């Protein structure tokens, strides 16, 4: 239908949107500590801490195949990758400091593209 075909250009255009977004916050990541899964070879009990592992490389396999739906799906999946470090690591660390700055970092990028999404609609 044509109704199908617009809902899919909607869905084309969000993943741009998103594409966007993902950049800009990898880019607040450049030690590039959030790039990549947590190696369960060098890290082999890390799914007895952590139930649901995320990171970029996974999320853009995601909005390349246009798997997020919405913001908050894509941002839901953001959040992973923040609290799941914040909790496996403790404070004093690389890793959580990371994870606190990309948070912080984050939030400016994702308050606007929640705006844009509305917006554009």
């Given at each position: ?17 998103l594409?966007?977004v993902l950049?800009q916050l990898?880019?607040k ?42 913001l908050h799906?894509f941002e839901?999946?953001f959040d ?22 990309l948070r912080d970092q984050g939030g400016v990028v994702l308050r606007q593209a929640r705006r844009e999404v509305?917006?554009?609609?």
């Open positions: 239908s044509m109704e199908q075909v617009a809902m899919e250009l909607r869905l084309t255009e969000l993943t741009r949107l594409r966007s950049d990898q880019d990541d450049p030690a590039r500590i959030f790039a990549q899964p947590v190696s369960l070879k060098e890290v082999p009990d890390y799914l007895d801490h952590i139930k649901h592992p995320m990171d970029f490389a996974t999320m853009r396999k995601r909005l390349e195949a246009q798997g997020y739906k919405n799906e839901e999946d992973l990758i923040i609290d799941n470090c914040m909790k496996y690591n403790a404070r004093d660390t690389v890793f959580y400091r990371a994870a606190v700055r509305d917006s554009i609609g």
